[PDB]
mmCIF file of C-alpha atoms and ligand atoms in Angstrom:
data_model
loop_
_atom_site.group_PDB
_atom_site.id
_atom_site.type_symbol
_atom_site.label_atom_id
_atom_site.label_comp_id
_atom_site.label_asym_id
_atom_site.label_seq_id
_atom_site.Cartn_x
_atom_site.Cartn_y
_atom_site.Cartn_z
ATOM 1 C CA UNK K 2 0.311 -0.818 3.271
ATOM 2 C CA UNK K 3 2.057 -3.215 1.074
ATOM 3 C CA UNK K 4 3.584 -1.795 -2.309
ATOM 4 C CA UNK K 5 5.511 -2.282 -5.113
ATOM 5 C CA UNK K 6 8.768 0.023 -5.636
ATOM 6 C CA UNK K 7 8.447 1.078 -9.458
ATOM 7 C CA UNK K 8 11.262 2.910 -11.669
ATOM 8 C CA UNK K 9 9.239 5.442 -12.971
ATOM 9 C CA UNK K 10 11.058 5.240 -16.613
ATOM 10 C CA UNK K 11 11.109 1.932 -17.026
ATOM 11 C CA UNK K 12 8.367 0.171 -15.532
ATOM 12 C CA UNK K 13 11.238 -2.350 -13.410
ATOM 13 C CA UNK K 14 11.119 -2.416 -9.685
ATOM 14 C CA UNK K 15 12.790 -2.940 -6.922
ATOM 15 C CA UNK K 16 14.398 -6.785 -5.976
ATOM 16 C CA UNK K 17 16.594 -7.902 -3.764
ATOM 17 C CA UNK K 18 18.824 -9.465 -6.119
ATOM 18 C CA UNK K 19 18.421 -13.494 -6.348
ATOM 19 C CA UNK K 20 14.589 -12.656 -5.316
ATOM 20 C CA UNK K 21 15.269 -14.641 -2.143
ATOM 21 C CA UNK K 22 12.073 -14.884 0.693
ATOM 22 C CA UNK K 23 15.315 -14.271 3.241
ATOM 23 C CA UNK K 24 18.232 -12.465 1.566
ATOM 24 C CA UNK K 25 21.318 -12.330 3.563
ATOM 25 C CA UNK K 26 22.785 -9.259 4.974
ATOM 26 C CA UNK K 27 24.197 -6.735 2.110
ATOM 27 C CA UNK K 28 22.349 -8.445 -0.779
ATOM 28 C CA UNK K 29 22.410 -5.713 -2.822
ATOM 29 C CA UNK K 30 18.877 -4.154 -4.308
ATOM 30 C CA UNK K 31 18.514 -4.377 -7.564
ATOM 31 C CA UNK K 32 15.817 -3.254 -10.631
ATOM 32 C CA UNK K 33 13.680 -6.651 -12.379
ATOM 33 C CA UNK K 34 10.507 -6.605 -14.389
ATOM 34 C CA UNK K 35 9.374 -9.513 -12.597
ATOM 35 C CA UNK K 36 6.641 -9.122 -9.850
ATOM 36 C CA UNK K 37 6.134 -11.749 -7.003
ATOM 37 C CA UNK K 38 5.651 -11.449 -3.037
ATOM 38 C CA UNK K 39 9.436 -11.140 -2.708
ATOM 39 C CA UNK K 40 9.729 -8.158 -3.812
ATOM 40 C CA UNK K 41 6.905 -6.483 -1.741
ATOM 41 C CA UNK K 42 7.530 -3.777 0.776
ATOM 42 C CA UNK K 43 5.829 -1.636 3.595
ATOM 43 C CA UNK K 44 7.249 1.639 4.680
ATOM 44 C CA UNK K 45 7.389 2.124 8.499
ATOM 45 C CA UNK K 46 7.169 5.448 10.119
ATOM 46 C CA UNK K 47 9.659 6.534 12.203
ATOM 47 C CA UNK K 48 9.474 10.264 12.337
ATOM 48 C CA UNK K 49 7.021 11.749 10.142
ATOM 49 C CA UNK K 50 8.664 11.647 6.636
ATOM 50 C CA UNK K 51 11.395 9.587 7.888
ATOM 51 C CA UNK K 52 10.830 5.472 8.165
ATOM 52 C CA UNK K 53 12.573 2.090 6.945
ATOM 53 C CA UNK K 54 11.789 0.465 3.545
ATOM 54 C CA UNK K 55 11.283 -2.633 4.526
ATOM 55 C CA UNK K 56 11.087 -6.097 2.444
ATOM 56 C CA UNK K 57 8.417 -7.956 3.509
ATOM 57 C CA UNK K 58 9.481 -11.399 3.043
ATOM 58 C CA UNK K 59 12.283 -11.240 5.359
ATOM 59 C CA UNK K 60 12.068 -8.022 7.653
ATOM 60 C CA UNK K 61 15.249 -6.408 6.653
ATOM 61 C CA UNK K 62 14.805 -2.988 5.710
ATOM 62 C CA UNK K 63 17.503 -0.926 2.782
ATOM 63 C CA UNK K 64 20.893 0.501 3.728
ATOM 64 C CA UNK K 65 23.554 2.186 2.032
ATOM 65 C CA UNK K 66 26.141 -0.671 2.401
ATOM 66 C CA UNK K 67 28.573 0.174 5.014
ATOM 67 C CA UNK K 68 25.160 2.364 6.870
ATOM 68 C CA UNK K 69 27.048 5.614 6.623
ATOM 69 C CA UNK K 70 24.751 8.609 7.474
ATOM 70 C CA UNK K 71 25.999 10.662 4.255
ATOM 71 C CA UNK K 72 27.050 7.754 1.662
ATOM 72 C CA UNK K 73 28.592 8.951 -1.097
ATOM 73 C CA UNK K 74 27.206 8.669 -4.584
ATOM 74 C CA UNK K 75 27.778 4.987 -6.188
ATOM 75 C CA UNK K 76 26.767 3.566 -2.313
ATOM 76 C CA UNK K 77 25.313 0.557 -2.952
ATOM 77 C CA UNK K 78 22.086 -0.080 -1.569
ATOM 78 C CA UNK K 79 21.336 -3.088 0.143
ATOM 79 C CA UNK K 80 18.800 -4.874 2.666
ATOM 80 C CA UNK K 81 19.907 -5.493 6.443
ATOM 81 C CA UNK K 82 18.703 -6.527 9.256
ATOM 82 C CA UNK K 83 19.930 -3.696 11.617
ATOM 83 C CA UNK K 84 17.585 -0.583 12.475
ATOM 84 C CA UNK K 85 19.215 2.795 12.797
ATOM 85 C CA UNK K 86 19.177 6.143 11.692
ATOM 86 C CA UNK K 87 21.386 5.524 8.922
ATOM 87 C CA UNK K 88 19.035 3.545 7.540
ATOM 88 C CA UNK K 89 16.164 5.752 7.123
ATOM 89 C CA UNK K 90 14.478 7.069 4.260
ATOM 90 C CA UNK K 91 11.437 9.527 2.929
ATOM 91 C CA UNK K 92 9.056 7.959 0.106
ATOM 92 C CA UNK K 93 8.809 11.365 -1.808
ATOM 93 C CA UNK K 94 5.183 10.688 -3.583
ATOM 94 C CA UNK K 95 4.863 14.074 -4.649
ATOM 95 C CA UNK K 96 8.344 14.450 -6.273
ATOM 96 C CA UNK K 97 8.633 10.771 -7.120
ATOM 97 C CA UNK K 98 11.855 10.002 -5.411
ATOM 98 C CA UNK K 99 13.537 8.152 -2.838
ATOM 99 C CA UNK K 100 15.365 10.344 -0.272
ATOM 100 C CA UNK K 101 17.813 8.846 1.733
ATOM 101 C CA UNK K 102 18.467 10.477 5.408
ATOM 102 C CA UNK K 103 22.036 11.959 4.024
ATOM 103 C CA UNK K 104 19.856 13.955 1.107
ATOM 104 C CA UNK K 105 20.951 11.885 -1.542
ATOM 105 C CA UNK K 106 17.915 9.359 -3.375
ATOM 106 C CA UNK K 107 17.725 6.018 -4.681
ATOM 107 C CA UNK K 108 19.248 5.406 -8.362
ATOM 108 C CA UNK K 109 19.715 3.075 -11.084
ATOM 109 C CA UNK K 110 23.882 2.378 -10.755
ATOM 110 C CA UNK K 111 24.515 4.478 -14.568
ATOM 111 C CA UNK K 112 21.345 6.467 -14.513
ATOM 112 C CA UNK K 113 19.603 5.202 -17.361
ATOM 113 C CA UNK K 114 15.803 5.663 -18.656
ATOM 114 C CA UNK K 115 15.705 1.951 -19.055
ATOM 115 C CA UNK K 116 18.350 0.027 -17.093
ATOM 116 C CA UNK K 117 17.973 -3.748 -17.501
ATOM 117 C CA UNK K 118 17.279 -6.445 -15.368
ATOM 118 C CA UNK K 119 19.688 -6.982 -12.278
ATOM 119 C CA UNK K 120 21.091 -3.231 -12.905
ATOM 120 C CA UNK K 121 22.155 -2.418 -9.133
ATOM 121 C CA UNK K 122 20.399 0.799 -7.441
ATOM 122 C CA UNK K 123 22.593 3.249 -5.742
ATOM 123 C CA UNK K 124 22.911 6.712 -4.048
ATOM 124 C CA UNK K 125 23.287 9.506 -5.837
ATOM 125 C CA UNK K 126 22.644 13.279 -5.272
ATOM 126 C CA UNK K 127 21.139 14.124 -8.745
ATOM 127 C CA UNK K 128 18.094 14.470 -9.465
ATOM 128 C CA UNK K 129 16.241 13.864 -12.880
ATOM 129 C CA UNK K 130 13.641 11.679 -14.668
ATOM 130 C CA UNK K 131 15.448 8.209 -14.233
ATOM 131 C CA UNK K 132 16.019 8.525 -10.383
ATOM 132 C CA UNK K 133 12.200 8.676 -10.191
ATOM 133 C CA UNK K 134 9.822 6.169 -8.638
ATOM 134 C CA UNK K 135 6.339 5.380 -7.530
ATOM 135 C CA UNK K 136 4.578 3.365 -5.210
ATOM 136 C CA UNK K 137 2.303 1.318 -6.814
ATOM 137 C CA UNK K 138 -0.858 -1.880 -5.726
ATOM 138 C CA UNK K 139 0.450 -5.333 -5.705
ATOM 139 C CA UNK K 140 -2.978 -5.969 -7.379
ATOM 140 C CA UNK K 141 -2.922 -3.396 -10.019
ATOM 141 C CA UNK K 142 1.281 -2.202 -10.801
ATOM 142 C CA UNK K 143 -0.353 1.309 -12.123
ATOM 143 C CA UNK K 144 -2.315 2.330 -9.580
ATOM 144 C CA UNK K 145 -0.535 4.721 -6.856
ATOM 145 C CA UNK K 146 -1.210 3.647 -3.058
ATOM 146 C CA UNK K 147 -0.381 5.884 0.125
ATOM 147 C CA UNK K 148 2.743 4.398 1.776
ATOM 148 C CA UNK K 149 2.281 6.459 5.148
ATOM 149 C CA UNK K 150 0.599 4.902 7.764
ATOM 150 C CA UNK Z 2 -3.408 13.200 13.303
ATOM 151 C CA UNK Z 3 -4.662 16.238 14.792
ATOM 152 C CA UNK Z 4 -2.162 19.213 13.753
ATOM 153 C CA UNK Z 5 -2.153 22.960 12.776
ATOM 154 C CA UNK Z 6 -1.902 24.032 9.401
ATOM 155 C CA UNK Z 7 1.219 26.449 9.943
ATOM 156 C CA UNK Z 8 1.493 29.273 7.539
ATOM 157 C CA UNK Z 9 5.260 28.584 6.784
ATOM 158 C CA UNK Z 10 6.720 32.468 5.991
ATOM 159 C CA UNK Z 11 4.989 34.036 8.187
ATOM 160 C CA UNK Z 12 4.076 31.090 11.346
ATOM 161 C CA UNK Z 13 0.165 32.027 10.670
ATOM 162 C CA UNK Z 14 -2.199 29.370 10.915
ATOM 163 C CA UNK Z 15 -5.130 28.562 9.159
ATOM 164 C CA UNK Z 16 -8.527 29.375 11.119
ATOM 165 C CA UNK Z 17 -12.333 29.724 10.556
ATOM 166 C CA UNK Z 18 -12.866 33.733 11.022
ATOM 167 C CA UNK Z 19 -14.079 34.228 13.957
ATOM 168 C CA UNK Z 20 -13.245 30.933 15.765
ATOM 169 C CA UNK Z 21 -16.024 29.214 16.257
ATOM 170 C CA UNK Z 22 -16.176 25.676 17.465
ATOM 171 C CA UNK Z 23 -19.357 25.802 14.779
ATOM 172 C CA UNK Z 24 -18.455 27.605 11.856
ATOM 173 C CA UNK Z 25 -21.567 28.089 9.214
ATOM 174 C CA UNK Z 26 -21.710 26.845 5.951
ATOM 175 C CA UNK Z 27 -19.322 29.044 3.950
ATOM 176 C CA UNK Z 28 -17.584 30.786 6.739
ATOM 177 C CA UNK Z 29 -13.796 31.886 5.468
ATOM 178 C CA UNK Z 30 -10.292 30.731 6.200
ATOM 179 C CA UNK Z 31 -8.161 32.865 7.348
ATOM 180 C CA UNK Z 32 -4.699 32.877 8.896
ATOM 181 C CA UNK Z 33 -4.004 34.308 12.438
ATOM 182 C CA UNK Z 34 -1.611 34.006 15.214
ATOM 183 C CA UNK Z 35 -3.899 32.321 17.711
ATOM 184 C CA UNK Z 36 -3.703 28.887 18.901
ATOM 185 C CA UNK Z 37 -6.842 26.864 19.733
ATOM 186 C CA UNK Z 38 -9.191 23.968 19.680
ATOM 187 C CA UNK Z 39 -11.056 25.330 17.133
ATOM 188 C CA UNK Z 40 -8.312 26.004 14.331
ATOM 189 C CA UNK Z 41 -7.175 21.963 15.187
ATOM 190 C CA UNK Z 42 -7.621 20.251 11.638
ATOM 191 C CA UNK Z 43 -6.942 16.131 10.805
ATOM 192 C CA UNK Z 44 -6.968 14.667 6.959
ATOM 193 C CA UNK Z 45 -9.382 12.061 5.745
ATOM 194 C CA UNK Z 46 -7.852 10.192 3.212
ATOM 195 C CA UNK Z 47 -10.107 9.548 0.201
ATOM 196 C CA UNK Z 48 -7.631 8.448 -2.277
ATOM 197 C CA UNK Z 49 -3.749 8.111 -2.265
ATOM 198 C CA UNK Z 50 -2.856 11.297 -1.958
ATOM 199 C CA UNK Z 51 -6.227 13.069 -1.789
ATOM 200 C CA UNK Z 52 -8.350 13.481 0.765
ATOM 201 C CA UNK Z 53 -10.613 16.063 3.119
ATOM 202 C CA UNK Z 54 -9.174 19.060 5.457
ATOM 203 C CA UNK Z 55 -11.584 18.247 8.157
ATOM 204 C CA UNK Z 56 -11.973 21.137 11.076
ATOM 205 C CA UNK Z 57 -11.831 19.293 13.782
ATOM 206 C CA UNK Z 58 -14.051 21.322 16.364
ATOM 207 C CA UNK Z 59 -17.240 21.091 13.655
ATOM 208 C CA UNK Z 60 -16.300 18.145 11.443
ATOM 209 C CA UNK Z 61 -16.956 20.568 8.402
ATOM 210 C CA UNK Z 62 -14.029 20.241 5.168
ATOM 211 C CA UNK Z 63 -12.134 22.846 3.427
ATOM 212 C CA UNK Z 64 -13.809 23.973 -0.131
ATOM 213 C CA UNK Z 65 -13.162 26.479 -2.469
ATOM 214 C CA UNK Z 66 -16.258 28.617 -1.908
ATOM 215 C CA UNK Z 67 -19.024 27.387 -4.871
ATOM 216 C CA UNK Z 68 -17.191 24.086 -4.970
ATOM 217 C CA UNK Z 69 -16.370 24.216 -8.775
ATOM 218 C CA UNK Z 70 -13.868 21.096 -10.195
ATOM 219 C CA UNK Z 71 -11.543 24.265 -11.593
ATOM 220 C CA UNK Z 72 -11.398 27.010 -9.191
ATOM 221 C CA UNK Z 73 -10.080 30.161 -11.131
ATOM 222 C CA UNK Z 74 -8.073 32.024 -8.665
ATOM 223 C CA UNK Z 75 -8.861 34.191 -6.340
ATOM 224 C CA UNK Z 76 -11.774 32.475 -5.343
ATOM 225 C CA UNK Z 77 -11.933 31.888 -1.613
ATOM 226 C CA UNK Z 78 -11.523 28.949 1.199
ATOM 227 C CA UNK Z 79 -14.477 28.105 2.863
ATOM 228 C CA UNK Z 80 -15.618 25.189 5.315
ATOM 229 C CA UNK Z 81 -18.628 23.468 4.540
ATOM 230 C CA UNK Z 82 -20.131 20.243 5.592
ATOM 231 C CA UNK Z 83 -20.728 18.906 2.102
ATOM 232 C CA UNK Z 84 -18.359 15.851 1.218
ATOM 233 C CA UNK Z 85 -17.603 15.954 -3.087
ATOM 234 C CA UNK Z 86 -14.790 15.496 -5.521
ATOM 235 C CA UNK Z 87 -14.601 19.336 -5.394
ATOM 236 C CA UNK Z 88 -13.074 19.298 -1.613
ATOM 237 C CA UNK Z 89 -10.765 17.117 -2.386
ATOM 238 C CA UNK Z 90 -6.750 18.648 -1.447
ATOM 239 C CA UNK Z 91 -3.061 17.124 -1.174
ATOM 240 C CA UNK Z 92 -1.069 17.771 1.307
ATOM 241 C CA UNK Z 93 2.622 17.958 0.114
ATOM 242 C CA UNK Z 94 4.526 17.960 3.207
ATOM 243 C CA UNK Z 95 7.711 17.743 0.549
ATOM 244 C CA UNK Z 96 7.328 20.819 -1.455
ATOM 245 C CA UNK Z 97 5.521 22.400 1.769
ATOM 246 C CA UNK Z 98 1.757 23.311 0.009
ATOM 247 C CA UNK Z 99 -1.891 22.661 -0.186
ATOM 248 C CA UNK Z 100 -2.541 21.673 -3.482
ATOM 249 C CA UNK Z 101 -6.400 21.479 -4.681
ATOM 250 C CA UNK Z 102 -7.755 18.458 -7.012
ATOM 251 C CA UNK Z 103 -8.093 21.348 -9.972
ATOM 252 C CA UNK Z 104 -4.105 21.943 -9.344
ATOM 253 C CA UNK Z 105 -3.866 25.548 -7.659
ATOM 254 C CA UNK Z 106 -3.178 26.330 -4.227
ATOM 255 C CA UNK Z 107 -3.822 27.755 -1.089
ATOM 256 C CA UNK Z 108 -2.453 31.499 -0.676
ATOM 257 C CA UNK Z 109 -2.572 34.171 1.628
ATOM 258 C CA UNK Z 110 -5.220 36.116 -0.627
ATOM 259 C CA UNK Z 111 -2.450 39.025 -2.163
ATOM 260 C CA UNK Z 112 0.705 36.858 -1.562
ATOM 261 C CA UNK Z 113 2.633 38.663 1.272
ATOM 262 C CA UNK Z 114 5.060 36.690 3.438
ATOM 263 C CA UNK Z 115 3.628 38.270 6.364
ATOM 264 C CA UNK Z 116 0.113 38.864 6.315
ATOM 265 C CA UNK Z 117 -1.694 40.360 9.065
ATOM 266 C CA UNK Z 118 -4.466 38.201 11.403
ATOM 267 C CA UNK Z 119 -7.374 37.764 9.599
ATOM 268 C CA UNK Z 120 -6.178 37.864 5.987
ATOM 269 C CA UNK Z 121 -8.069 35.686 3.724
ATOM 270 C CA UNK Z 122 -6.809 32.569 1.950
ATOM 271 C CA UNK Z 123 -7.778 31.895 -1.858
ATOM 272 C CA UNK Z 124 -7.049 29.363 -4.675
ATOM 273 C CA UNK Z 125 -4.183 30.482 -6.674
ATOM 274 C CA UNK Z 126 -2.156 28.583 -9.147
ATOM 275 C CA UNK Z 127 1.262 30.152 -8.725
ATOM 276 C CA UNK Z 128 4.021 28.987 -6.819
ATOM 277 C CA UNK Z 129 6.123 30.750 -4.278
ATOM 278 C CA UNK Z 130 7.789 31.390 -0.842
ATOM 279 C CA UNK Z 131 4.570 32.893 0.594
ATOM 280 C CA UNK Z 132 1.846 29.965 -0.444
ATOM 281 C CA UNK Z 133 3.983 27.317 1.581
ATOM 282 C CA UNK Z 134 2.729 25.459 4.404
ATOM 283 C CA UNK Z 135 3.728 22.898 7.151
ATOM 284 C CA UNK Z 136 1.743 20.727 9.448
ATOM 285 C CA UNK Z 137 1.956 20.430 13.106
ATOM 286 C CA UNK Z 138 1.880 19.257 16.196
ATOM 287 C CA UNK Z 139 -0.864 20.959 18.498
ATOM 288 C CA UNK Z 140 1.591 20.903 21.345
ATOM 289 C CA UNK Z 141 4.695 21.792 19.598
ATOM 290 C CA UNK Z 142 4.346 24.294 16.693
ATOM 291 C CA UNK Z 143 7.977 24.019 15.503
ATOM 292 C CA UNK Z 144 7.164 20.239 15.210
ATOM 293 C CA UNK Z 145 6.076 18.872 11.903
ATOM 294 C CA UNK Z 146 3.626 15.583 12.238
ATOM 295 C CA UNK Z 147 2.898 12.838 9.431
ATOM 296 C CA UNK Z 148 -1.148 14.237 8.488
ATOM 297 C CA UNK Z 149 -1.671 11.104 6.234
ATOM 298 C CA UNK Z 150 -2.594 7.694 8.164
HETATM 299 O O1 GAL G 1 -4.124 36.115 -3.893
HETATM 300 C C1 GAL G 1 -3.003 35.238 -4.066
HETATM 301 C C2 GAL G 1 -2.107 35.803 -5.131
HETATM 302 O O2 GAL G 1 -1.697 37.138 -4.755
HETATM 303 C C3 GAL G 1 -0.950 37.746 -5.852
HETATM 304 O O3 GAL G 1 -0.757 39.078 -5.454
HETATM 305 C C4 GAL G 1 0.358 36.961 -5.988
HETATM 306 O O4 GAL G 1 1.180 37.534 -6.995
HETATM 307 C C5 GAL G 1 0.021 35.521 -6.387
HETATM 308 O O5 GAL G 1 1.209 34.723 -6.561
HETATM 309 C C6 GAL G 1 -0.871 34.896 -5.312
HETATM 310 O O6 GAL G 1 -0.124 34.733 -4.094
HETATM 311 O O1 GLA G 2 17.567 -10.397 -8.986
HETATM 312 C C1 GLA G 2 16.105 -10.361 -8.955
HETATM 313 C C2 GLA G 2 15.583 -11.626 -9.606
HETATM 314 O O2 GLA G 2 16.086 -12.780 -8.925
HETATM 315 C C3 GLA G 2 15.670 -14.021 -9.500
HETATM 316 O O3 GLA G 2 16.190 -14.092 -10.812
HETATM 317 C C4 GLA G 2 14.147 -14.122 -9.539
HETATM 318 O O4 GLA G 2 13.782 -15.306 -10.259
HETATM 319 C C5 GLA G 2 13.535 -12.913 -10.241
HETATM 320 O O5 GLA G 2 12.111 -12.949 -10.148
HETATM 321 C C6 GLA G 2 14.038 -11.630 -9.593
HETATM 322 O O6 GLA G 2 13.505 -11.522 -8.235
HETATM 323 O O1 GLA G 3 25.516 -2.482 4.838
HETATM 324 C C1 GLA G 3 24.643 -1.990 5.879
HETATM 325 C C2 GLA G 3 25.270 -2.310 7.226
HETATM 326 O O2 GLA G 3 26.511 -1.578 7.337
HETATM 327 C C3 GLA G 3 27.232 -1.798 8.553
HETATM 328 O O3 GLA G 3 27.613 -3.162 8.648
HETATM 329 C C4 GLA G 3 26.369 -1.402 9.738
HETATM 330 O O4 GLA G 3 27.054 -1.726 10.942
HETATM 331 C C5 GLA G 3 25.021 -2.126 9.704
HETATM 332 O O5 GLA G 3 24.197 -1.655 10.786
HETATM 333 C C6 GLA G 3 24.333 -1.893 8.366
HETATM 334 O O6 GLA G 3 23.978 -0.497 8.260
HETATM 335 O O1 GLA G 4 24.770 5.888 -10.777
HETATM 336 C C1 GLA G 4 23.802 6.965 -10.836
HETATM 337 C C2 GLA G 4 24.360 8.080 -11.687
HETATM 338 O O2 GLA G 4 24.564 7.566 -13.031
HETATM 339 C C3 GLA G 4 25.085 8.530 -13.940
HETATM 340 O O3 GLA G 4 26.404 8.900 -13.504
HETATM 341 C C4 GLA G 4 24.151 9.755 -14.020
HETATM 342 O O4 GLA G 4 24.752 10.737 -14.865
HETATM 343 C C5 GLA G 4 23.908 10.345 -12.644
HETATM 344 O O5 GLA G 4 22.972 11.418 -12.717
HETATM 345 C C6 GLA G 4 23.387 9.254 -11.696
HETATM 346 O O6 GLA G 4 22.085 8.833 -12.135
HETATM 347 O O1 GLA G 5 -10.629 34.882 12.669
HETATM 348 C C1 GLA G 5 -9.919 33.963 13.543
HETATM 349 C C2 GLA G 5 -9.957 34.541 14.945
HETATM 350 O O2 GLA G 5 -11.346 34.663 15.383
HETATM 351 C C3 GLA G 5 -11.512 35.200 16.680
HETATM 352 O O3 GLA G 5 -11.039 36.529 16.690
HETATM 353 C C4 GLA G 5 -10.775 34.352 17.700
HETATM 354 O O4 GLA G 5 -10.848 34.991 18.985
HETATM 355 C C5 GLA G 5 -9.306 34.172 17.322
HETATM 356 O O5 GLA G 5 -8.653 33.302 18.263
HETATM 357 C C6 GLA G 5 -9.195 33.624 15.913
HETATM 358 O O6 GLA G 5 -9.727 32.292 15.870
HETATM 359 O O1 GLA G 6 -18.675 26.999 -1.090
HETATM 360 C C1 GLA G 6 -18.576 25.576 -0.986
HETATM 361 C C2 GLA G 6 -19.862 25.081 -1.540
HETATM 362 O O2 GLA G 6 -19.975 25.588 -2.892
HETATM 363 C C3 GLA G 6 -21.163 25.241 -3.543
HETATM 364 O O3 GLA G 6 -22.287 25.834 -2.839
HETATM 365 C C4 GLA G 6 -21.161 23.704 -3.622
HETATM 366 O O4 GLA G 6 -22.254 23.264 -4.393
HETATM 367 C C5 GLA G 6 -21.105 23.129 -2.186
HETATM 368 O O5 GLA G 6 -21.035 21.747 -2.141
HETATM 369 C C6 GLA G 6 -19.827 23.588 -1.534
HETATM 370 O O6 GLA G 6 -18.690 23.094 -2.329
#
């Protein structure tokens, strides 16, 4: 299934920054308003929870930049190439969150409610209201749709 | 995904009483030690998140018994072959619960952690140790598997 990563609070989503169809290695991911088929994604099951985010414009899936298995909070996130299990992730649709393998989720870098365009996502073990995201239609950006498959 | 609904305090699982590969129309569900074809279960996703707890051996769906939108609790889990908005269940493998479309629960009717074979299971809306439960593999009890597909 093909989906849109939304910030709960703010109605952004996730980019890889520049929007490219074939981001390099360790462009970081970043939160934009705008919505076009690069910034699509499909979750692939690994182990029941656990699978890669995956852009689908270029295959490369999200890392923590440097693909440490317990990044420390401020890790960048970014898209790679590589597959490995420092790279994999639980979609949270019940809680709303992004977990990373490590137990930390996916944040705005700062934490704000509203963080504006281009604001860089990060790790971070907290969890509150502007760490939140769903998983939204690329037809219709408000209506949930089941990333497990 | 064929699994066993795993009673998660207690490693109960969730069966028809009695067993039977045909259960009638409004026969209970219970929890009990016993591993078999006929307490094998799979989810039919209806929408996102919500969708049927089909028993596999008869095809019939988890209800709360007089199929009301709003079960109050204490009212008890049933099969039944009808298909309606009022079988409709989550299954949050992240919080570890089976959460009806009216918001409540399944419990182990009383709330003990260790319930003996054949206690009933009910709607209730509270939250606890002793209502969680965990999905798995019919070959490997200890071994959660992804229900949604
Ligand atoms: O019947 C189920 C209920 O049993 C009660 O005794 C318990 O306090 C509730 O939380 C719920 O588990
Ligand atoms: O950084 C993300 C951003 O990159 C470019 O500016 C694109 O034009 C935008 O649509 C968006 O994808
Ligand atoms: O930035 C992510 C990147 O980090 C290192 O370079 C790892 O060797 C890669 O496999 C990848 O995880
Ligand atoms: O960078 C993310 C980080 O930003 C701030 O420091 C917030 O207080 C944290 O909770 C977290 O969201
Ligand atoms: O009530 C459930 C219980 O019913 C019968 O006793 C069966 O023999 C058991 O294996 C179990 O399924
Ligand atoms: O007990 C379950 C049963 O409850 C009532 O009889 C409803 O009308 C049926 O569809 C079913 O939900």
């Amino acid at each position: 299934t093909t989906f849109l990563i939304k910030h709960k609070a703010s109605g952004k989503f996730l980019h890889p920054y520049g929007g490219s169809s074939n981001p390099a290695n360790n462009t970081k991911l970043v939160l934009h308003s705008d919505i076009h088929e690069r910034m699509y994604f499909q979750f692939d099951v690994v182990d029941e929870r656990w699978g890669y985010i995956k852009h689908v414009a270029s295959g490369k899936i999200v890392h923590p930049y440097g693909g440490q298995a317990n990044p420390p909070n401020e890790t960048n996130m970014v898209l790679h190439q590589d597959r490995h299990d420092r790279a994999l992730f639980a979609m949270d649709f019940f809680n709303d969150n992004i977990m990373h393998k490590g137990g930390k989720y996916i944040h705005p870098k700062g934490g704000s409610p509203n963080p504006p365009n281009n604001t860089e996502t990060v790790i971070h073990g907290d969890k509150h209201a502007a760490m939140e995201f769903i998983f939204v239609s690329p037809k219709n950006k408000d209506k949930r749709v089941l990333v497990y498959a």
